[PDB]
């Protein structure tokens, strides 16, 4: 056994040799370890408390004596002193924890389990003694010095990262809770109590100073660059000389000071930068404001208002010319969408909220713009879209390239997605598809198939079921034409060539033709085809409208031969001219049974082309109001440069008539569909408030056509007069089925 | 590397750096002190061990050079005493004084494995024995006076 | 010249840490120094945290040193130190798991029974109870004779099975001495019925010492001394620990606010389509006997449908099909319309259950088949779910000694 | 003596 006073002199000399680091040898280390070991194993029966008391007193005395050399120092000098003394103290205490390791494992561990909190591991005793003799009196000075060094580093200068990293490492390690040194993770109790709080409350002051000293004398365009640089720079000073847990708090505080405090100046510059379309700075501003959660809400409103206003200005620039030129209008809307879609996809990083604001902006724009207000109806926009879509697929002189045509039809479908009243587009496209398919005016059938498939992908199947039935009816009619040609070759033939395209009455929206006198050869051809038709499949009927059928006649009575193609009405009138030349309008009406208006327009076209003369050529030709007593005489001296000249060109007064007939038909279709929808709704509901009922109808039909409240009141009046949707007894609010 | 350990009597015992690093004291000496290259070949005196016991410690650490680390602690378990390795059982078959000096030198260098197996082998010589058998086996005299013998008899009746 | 006394106080504390409790008790007689070291408080911590499961929180609540905790406990339940750890572990696993599920059973549990009552029971029956049996009743005397019990509750339409752990007084009153069940002591009762799994206190008349067997009365033999058995398991510790492990691990599911005896194997599943058809298993010796072999098995077929099914996919159980296959080789098929007289509809996310009943002359067997189903909305679609190959297992068919003679 | 060579037509198929 060895008493403490017999060994404490040598042990104290050795520990003082450790702290005043003079490059000790391992022999002295093992002599010191034997000195601790030979005392802790000698004979309230566990020796080692006295040695712990002398170690605590020695470390307290050493740190109190060390403090007197650093209390007067300030700024860089006290920080250098603290970091050098902390590194030396930490290393020499890590040595002392190995010297007094036996007391660290078999008395400190023994007396820390049995309560007795207040005695710690010798290393953790050295940190606690550091936390009470050289950290508390040098806390404010050192943290002020490192704050000033951070100020000098932020101001643009270069400063030592080693000193700051040493101070921050000391502040992190000093946070070791003494009561349970066997803790989990790194302890930051001291760190976020004397430095992180002070540094994080001083960075607020320094960035509010840079903000309202740079934003005052520089535009916001440069301030965004400076703010992005500062945010990256404080992402840098968490990994250089700070702790990794200050990253989130520091980035959040820098965002709240640089951005959130001055978000009121970003919005007033958002419109200015959007007007000049500086896409790079828009991307920089979105990348800056997006860090502020819930602050992006005002940017979407400004963006959608600007997109709507810019589109409205573009459509106003189109003016009256866009009404009669569908390509210009659709190209203007498409160009606005293309310009303000890259700005959302590239600058705004294709954000869901921003692309939703773009979609909502054009929805209020394509349906209701200057050209629609000029036509006092929102149906002019999908009608113009349908006209443009018909113009691309029409057989022009220059056929469009198939890849180019597919791309521009996809662009049209992109425009179509924002059309509110898709029903008007459906009806107009159906009629244009009819007028193209019955005349073989389609540029390419695969283009039509692709458009039908894209419409199918866009809006259900009932939207384009009629169109698909029309296309398959065209195919079936082609097969039937081939079969009738084979039958004509087999059976008795017709001198007149015959080529029909039989179409379903359910599809192909058309108008039933007026009464018509069938020519004798045409009567024979009609009877032959009906015989073949009954031979194939009999139990049905055919309407035989001659409004959209043509053919060419040989003018042998003329001075020169002609192969002039003419409509069936015009074919009958020319046959009547062949039978007798002198012929009156009243005779035309009573023999050909054609209605007077359409027959008058036919005669107007015939006089317009100078196909044959009237009873007086010197009278009005293109502006004559023909009367039943007007006589028309065959003119054999008609001259033209070509023989296959077309007289079946459309007349100017019928395009608008078909347009308004389409509007009436789609209005009746709207009425029928909303009647059926409200019937289903009241079948599933059986009682509902009036405004709730109209809201339910609007939400139920919103996927295909947004209804109008006066039309809803008209159809509900029709149904309440029809007892299908009758009123319940004595109520003005609700009713029952 | 090669560290040199000598005894209180003084005998050079060169040990591989990874063999002596099993002992916690030598490992902390070679790690925390930094292993300065100035005079690294100088012997490291261990003035509480003798020559033969240090040689046996080196031999044991050589046999357990590739030994896996211990499985932390088993306080809720019951310290399975019969898991001593067969070589470890054979190596510790020495006299009681030599075994006790090996315990003392195993605690000095803070070796976990050697101290654990020596404590287990000593406990196997105490486990399930009468007190007179324990005293005769360990050559321990009985300093109980009649008053002191009767003093422990009052409590220890709780377990007969 | 070094001895055990001459060793320092620190390695000597490691040597004494490797000793058992008996040796640390015996070390106080060795020497004065070893008397001080043997009374070390952390030394008697692994001796209390393993032999009695007294954790640190119990010490802090009691505010007593570890050695005194060992001595005080050894003066109360010290005769059963070799089994108290397992018994209290089972009791603490049961009384912690059932508290969130069935607090009624926990509140029905009585406090511990004193040694005087157990000695009175020993005097009344004239024999000595098993030491492991006595140790559990020092922790909990059991329950009052009320429904539900603690040892399982099997629900059937015409025969309710629910047993509670009998107290020592009721066990002494119901102690068996008649021929057949000789030297047998019941420790459970049903109140609804008269089933009592007797314990063995002497190995005589063809009985293993400390075995858990059902009643199983003989039906062919008219001699009342001919009583068969159903050996549930080994001695009291094994039986109780097995029951506790089944209850807390999920082997015995908790349904209808009661502990049920449904031995359910998760691998015995034959999910067809999107309907899980996992079937439980149970055995009831009340309607069973070795000769004639009936071996009444029953189980609750739990069926449910996944949420992937459409709301229109509401299949209705048209009929059930049985493929009762005895392990002997006999196969019987039943095409009874519906299950237990019911036509349930399995909605998406709906869980339906229904008990079954069967007899088995053969020791084992399985009843597979299909359950005919038909969607309510989808009239045309008809499908079925295949019953799995779950095996009905029942314990040893030990017969009386007089039955063989 | 006018003569017609090539003629096409369109007819509406209505189900009775």
PDB file of C-alpha atoms in Angstrom, chain C residues 13-100:
ATOM      1  CA  UNK C  13     -15.189  -7.392  -6.930  1.00  0.00           C
ATOM      2  CA  UNK C  14     -14.961  -8.892 -10.412  1.00  0.00           C
ATOM      3  CA  UNK C  15     -14.307 -12.379  -9.013  1.00  0.00           C
ATOM      4  CA  UNK C  16     -17.346 -12.138  -6.733  1.00  0.00           C
ATOM      5  CA  UNK C  17     -19.432 -10.906  -9.674  1.00  0.00           C
ATOM      6  CA  UNK C  18     -19.022 -14.318 -11.338  1.00  0.00           C
ATOM      7  CA  UNK C  19     -20.382 -16.242  -8.334  1.00  0.00           C
ATOM      8  CA  UNK C  20     -23.955 -17.397  -7.870  1.00  0.00           C
ATOM      9  CA  UNK C  21     -26.163 -16.079  -5.076  1.00  0.00           C
ATOM     10  CA  UNK C  22     -25.442 -19.119  -2.886  1.00  0.00           C
ATOM     11  CA  UNK C  23     -21.691 -18.514  -3.122  1.00  0.00           C
ATOM     12  CA  UNK C  24     -21.983 -14.800  -2.308  1.00  0.00           C
ATOM     13  CA  UNK C  25     -24.090 -15.856   0.673  1.00  0.00           C
ATOM     14  CA  UNK C  26     -21.400 -18.376   1.610  1.00  0.00           C
ATOM     15  CA  UNK C  27     -18.552 -15.889   1.091  1.00  0.00           C
ATOM     16  CA  UNK C  28     -19.580 -13.979   4.230  1.00  0.00           C
ATOM     17  CA  UNK C  29     -18.258 -16.912   6.294  1.00  0.00           C
ATOM     18  CA  UNK C  30     -14.806 -16.848   4.669  1.00  0.00           C
ATOM     19  CA  UNK C  31     -13.022 -13.759   5.983  1.00  0.00           C
ATOM     20  CA  UNK C  32     -13.666 -10.298   7.394  1.00  0.00           C
ATOM     21  CA  UNK C  33     -12.469  -8.572   4.224  1.00  0.00           C
ATOM     22  CA  UNK C  34     -14.563 -10.863   2.022  1.00  0.00           C
ATOM     23  CA  UNK C  35     -17.538 -10.182   4.303  1.00  0.00           C
ATOM     24  CA  UNK C  36     -17.300  -6.488   3.408  1.00  0.00           C
ATOM     25  CA  UNK C  37     -16.872  -7.175  -0.314  1.00  0.00           C
ATOM     26  CA  UNK C  38     -19.706  -9.721  -0.491  1.00  0.00           C
ATOM     27  CA  UNK C  39     -22.090  -7.069   0.876  1.00  0.00           C
ATOM     28  CA  UNK C  40     -21.390  -4.798  -2.106  1.00  0.00           C
ATOM     29  CA  UNK C  41     -24.625  -3.284  -3.397  1.00  0.00           C
ATOM     30  CA  UNK C  42     -23.930  -3.629  -7.175  1.00  0.00           C
ATOM     31  CA  UNK C  43     -22.970  -7.263  -6.546  1.00  0.00           C
ATOM     32  CA  UNK C  44     -26.577  -8.080  -5.623  1.00  0.00           C
ATOM     33  CA  UNK C  45     -28.020  -6.495  -8.772  1.00  0.00           C
ATOM     34  CA  UNK C  46     -27.750  -9.266 -11.342  1.00  0.00           C
ATOM     35  CA  UNK C  47     -28.878 -11.602  -8.556  1.00  0.00           C
ATOM     36  CA  UNK C  48     -32.079  -9.543  -8.241  1.00  0.00           C
ATOM     37  CA  UNK C  49     -32.578  -8.563 -11.886  1.00  0.00           C
ATOM     38  CA  UNK C  50     -32.540 -12.231 -12.934  1.00  0.00           C
ATOM     39  CA  UNK C  51     -33.685 -14.384 -10.003  1.00  0.00           C
ATOM     40  CA  UNK C  52     -36.665 -12.141  -9.191  1.00  0.00           C
ATOM     41  CA  UNK C  53     -36.936  -9.748 -12.194  1.00  0.00           C
ATOM     42  CA  UNK C  54     -36.826  -6.782  -9.791  1.00  0.00           C
ATOM     43  CA  UNK C  55     -35.777  -3.951 -12.096  1.00  0.00           C
ATOM     44  CA  UNK C  56     -34.239  -0.649 -11.007  1.00  0.00           C
ATOM     45  CA  UNK C  57     -37.615   1.119 -10.973  1.00  0.00           C
ATOM     46  CA  UNK C  58     -38.883  -1.294  -8.315  1.00  0.00           C
ATOM     47  CA  UNK C  59     -35.789  -0.548  -6.221  1.00  0.00           C
ATOM     48  CA  UNK C  60     -36.328   3.207  -6.543  1.00  0.00           C
ATOM     49  CA  UNK C  61     -40.001   2.818  -5.609  1.00  0.00           C
ATOM     50  CA  UNK C  62     -39.177   0.619  -2.611  1.00  0.00           C
ATOM     51  CA  UNK C  63     -36.105   2.738  -1.704  1.00  0.00           C
ATOM     52  CA  UNK C  64     -34.068  -0.140  -0.300  1.00  0.00           C
ATOM     53  CA  UNK C  65     -30.581  -1.445  -1.002  1.00  0.00           C
ATOM     54  CA  UNK C  66     -30.097  -4.356  -3.390  1.00  0.00           C
ATOM     55  CA  UNK C  67     -28.924  -6.898  -0.807  1.00  0.00           C
ATOM     56  CA  UNK C  68     -31.896  -6.123   1.441  1.00  0.00           C
ATOM     57  CA  UNK C  69     -34.156  -6.466  -1.607  1.00  0.00           C
ATOM     58  CA  UNK C  70     -32.724  -9.943  -2.160  1.00  0.00           C
ATOM     59  CA  UNK C  71     -33.046 -10.914   1.516  1.00  0.00           C
ATOM     60  CA  UNK C  72     -36.589  -9.561   1.888  1.00  0.00           C
ATOM     61  CA  UNK C  73     -37.740 -11.317  -1.288  1.00  0.00           C
ATOM     62  CA  UNK C  74     -35.988 -14.553  -0.278  1.00  0.00           C
ATOM     63  CA  UNK C  75     -37.897 -14.448   3.021  1.00  0.00           C
ATOM     64  CA  UNK C  76     -41.187 -14.454   1.070  1.00  0.00           C
ATOM     65  CA  UNK C  77     -40.802 -16.477  -2.149  1.00  0.00           C
ATOM     66  CA  UNK C  78     -37.301 -17.838  -1.545  1.00  0.00           C
ATOM     67  CA  UNK C  79     -38.308 -21.502  -1.612  1.00  0.00           C
ATOM     68  CA  UNK C  80     -39.133 -21.149  -5.330  1.00  0.00           C
ATOM     69  CA  UNK C  81     -36.088 -19.219  -6.563  1.00  0.00           C
ATOM     70  CA  UNK C  82     -35.430 -21.695  -9.391  1.00  0.00           C
ATOM     71  CA  UNK C  83     -38.879 -21.107 -10.948  1.00  0.00           C
ATOM     72  CA  UNK C  84     -39.885 -17.604  -9.801  1.00  0.00           C
ATOM     73  CA  UNK C  85     -38.070 -15.965 -12.715  1.00  0.00           C
ATOM     74  CA  UNK C  86     -40.001 -17.916 -15.354  1.00  0.00           C
ATOM     75  CA  UNK C  87     -43.327 -17.734 -13.501  1.00  0.00           C
ATOM     76  CA  UNK C  88     -43.156 -13.982 -12.889  1.00  0.00           C
ATOM     77  CA  UNK C  89     -41.954 -13.414 -16.459  1.00  0.00           C
ATOM     78  CA  UNK C  90     -45.041 -15.247 -17.724  1.00  0.00           C
ATOM     79  CA  UNK C  91     -47.336 -13.388 -15.309  1.00  0.00           C
ATOM     80  CA  UNK C  92     -45.854 -10.005 -16.257  1.00  0.00           C
ATOM     81  CA  UNK C  93     -46.113 -10.808 -19.967  1.00  0.00           C
ATOM     82  CA  UNK C  94     -49.768 -11.746 -19.467  1.00  0.00           C
ATOM     83  CA  UNK C  95     -50.712  -8.862 -17.168  1.00  0.00           C
ATOM     84  CA  UNK C  96     -49.022  -6.301 -19.441  1.00  0.00           C
ATOM     85  CA  UNK C  97     -50.418  -7.594 -22.752  1.00  0.00           C
ATOM     86  CA  UNK C  98     -54.023  -8.114 -21.606  1.00  0.00           C
ATOM     87  CA  UNK C  99     -54.255  -4.682 -19.947  1.00  0.00           C
ATOM     88  CA  UNK C 100     -54.780  -2.714 -23.214  1.00  0.00           C
TER      89      UNK C 100
END
